């Protein structure tokens, strides 16, 4: 994480696709190093199909510069998450901020 910072790093992490942002708010049903399944709140949920949002995380894979791009879950089993929250950090991102 940057110890000295600005406050844009939070915004940069989310707007760039490196991270995984919550589609809808709720409580996490399942947390794995592979995937993340979120149980949607009813106010945010559409009437049909009920639903849960399943985020399939990217694992160790080749980048353009031959670096490693790998996602890790930043949330824990059974935790409330609100829409627009960081579910998993990407490479060089820590808890929603940008750590280079």
């Amino acid at each position: 994480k940057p110890l000295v910072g600005t406050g844009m790093e939070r915004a940069v992490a989310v707007d760039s696709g490196v991270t995984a942002v919550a589609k809808r708010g709720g409580v996490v049903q399942y947390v794995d190093a592979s995937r993340i399944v979120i149980k949607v709140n009813e106010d945010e949920m559409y009437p049909g199909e009920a639903g849960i949002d399943i985020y399939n995380l990217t694992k160790y894979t080749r980048s353009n510069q031959n670096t490693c791009i790998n996602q890790m879950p930043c949330v824990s089993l059974g935790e409330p998450v609100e829409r627009g929250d960081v579910l998993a950090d990407g490479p060089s991102t820590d808890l929603g901020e940008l750590a280079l």
Binding site: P2, L3, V4, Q65, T67, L100
Partner: protein
């Protein structure tokens, strides 16, 4: 504000302290500035260029 945060820190206002050489163990004349700098590793890495 930085100096003020340093008062809450227990650390000097100067941002400099005394440092001792790990070899001779003797002191270093004058205080030296020590702190935490964010540092990046760029990829020019020596076992590419070589």
């Amino acid at each position: 504000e930085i100096k003020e945060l340093l008062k809450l820190g227990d650390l000097p206002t100067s941002g400099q302290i005394r440092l001792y050489d790990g070899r001779t163990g003797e002191q270093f004349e004058r205080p030296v500035t020590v702190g935490y700098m964010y540092m990046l590793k760029l990829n020019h890495l020596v076992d590419d260029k070589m």
